[PDB]
Amino acid sequence: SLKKIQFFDTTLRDGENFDVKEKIQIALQLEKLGIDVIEAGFPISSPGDFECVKAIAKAIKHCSVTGLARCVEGDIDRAEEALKDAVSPQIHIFLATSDVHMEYKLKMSRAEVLASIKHHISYARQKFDVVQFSPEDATRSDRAFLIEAVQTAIDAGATVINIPDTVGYTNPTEFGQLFQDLRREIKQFDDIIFASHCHDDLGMATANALAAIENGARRVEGTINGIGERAGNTALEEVAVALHIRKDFYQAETNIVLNQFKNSSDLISRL
Template identity: 60%
Template sequence: MTKQIQFFDTTLRDGEQTIGVNFSIEEKVEIAKQLEAWGVDCIEAGFPVASEGDFEAVSAVANAVKHTCVTGLARARKGDIDACVKATANAAHKQIHVFIATSPVHRDSKLHMTKQQVLDTIKDTVTYAHQFFDIVEFSPEDATRTEHDYLCEAIQTAIDAGATVINIPDTVGYTNPEEFAELFQYMQKHIPSFDDVTFSVHCHDDLGMAVANSLASIKNGATRIEGTINGIGERAGNAALEEVADALYVRKNYYDATDNINLAETKETSDMISDYAKMPVPHNKAVVGANAFAHESGIHQDGMLKNPNTYEIITPETVGAHKTTLPLGKLSGSHAVMTKLNKMGFDVDRDDMKKIFPIFKNKADHTAIVGEDDLRNIMKQVKEVVA
C-alpha cells in the first residue's frame, strides 16, 4: 500500500538556530505562507516560552496560515505547554510538540534525572498537553543514543498518556541508514502501540547523512519527515526537506510513497529562505543549487543535447528552476559549442568546427566560462584566419 508521507517543517524554529540567522516576525509570516504553498503538512513556528518575540511569531503564523497545521515546541514542562496553548489559540489547525531527553549522557549530565523520573515527567506532561491538543507530538531527544529497550518504554509511556505522534530525533546526527532501519524494526517489535500512532523523524546532518537517514526511516515505518528548507539549522543543519521531497518523487517506485508537496514551488521556497537567512545556497547543492542543472563536461553536454535523460533524472521545471544550462568551459566539446553558436545565429557545421574549436579551446584554457561575447570574438578570429 502506498504510504502518505507528511512533511513537518522546522525552518522557523530549528532553522533559526543557525548561527547568525534571525527572522523577523514579518519574514516568518511570509515564509509560513510560502511553506503552505509548497505543501508542508505542519509548520513548527517557534518555541513560544523562549521569548516574547518567539511567542508573537508563533501567534502571527497561527493567524496567517489557513490549511497547514501549526505547532510550537515545548519542553516537558507545564509552563512551556501553557505558552504553546496561548500562542496557537487562533490556528485553524494545531498541534503541540513536547520533548525531553532520554539518552544516558543527557539524563546524567544535562537533566540530572533517573530513568524513572524521566518516565514520570513524560506521563505527567503529555497527559497535561493532551487536555488542550488533539494532536500531541512527543520527542525523546537524542533517541538514537538511547538504550533501545528504555527508548521503547519511554515511547509507550508517551502513547499511553495521549501522544498521537512520536518523533525519533537523531539529535546529533549520530546514526546511519542501516542502524536507523534496525532501530525502527526494533521499535515495531517492542512497542505494542507502534501502529496506533504516527512515527516521525528529525535528523541532523553532523555526519552528512540526515537525508539518507530520513529516507531510510520511510522504508521502515516512519510516515512523517521533519527538516528545514536548504537544510539550515543547529551546527551542520537538518535534513533538507527539498531533497527528501525530490527523492520521493524521482524514486517513487522504490519508496512507494506520496506526499502533498508542490515541487514547482521548491526553488522559490529555497530562494526565500536563502534571502531572509542571508545564507547563499552552495552552487553544488542538490535540487536547488545553481549548478544542479548545469553541465560543463563535453561528454555530459553531448549526452544532454542528444537526450536530457542521459544526465538529468529530473527536469529543472519540475522544481521551479529556470532551465538546464550548458556553460562552455575548457571541458566542453565541439557539439555544445556548435549548438551554442547556431543558437546565436551563426550558421556553422561540423566542418566549420574544425577551424573554430581549436581557437575556442585556446580561449577556454585561460577563461573559466566562455560567454557569448567571447564566442563572437572567436568567430571574428576565424574569419580573419580564413581570409
C-alpha cells in the same frame, strides 16, 4: 503508491536572523508548498517567540501550526496560549532519554523521566488533540529504555512520535534498525504517526530520513535547504524528490507541490 508521507518544517525555528514579516512570509510560502506541519517557534523561550507564534498561527489557514514545549506545565500553557487561534494547532513536547542527558542535564532517573513524560503528555493532551513527542538524543539512548519512553508517550496520548538523531552521527543501517525495534516492541506502532528528525553532521540526514521511511516512519521533519543547527538538518526538498523519482522503491506519496520548491528555496536563501 498509497502510503502518505507528511512533511514537518522547522525552518522558522532553526533561524539560529528572521524578522516578523519575514517569518510570516516564509510561513505562507511553506503553506503554499504543501508542508503539512509548520513548527512556528518555542513560545516560552521569549515574549518575541510567543508573539511570533501567535502571528504565524493567525496567518495560516491550510496546514497545521505547532510550537515547542519542554515537559514543564508552564511551557505547555504558554504554547496553548500562543496557538489558540491556529486553524489546526499541535504541540511538540520533548525530553531527553539518553543516560548522559538524564545524568548530567536533567539530573533525573529513568523512573522520573517516564513519570515526567506521562504527566506532561497527559497534561498537554487535555489542551491539544494532537501531541507530538520527541525523545531527545534518542539515537544515543539505551534502546530498551527508548522503547519505554516512547510507549509512555503513546499511552499518555501522544499520537506523533518523532525520533531525532540529535547528535547527527547515525547511519541508515543503525537508524533503520531503531525503527524496526520500535515496530517490533510497540503494539500500537501502526496506529501512531512516527517521524524522524535527522542532522547532517555526517552528510547522511537525507539517507537517514529515507531509511526511517523504509522502516515505518510516515513523516519527516527538517528544513527548507537543510539549514540550521551545527551542521544542518534534513533537506526536505531532497527527501521529496527522492520519494518522487524512486516511487517504484519507496512506494509513497506526499502532499508537496514540487514546483513550489525553488520559490521556497530562493525565498529562504534570500533572507
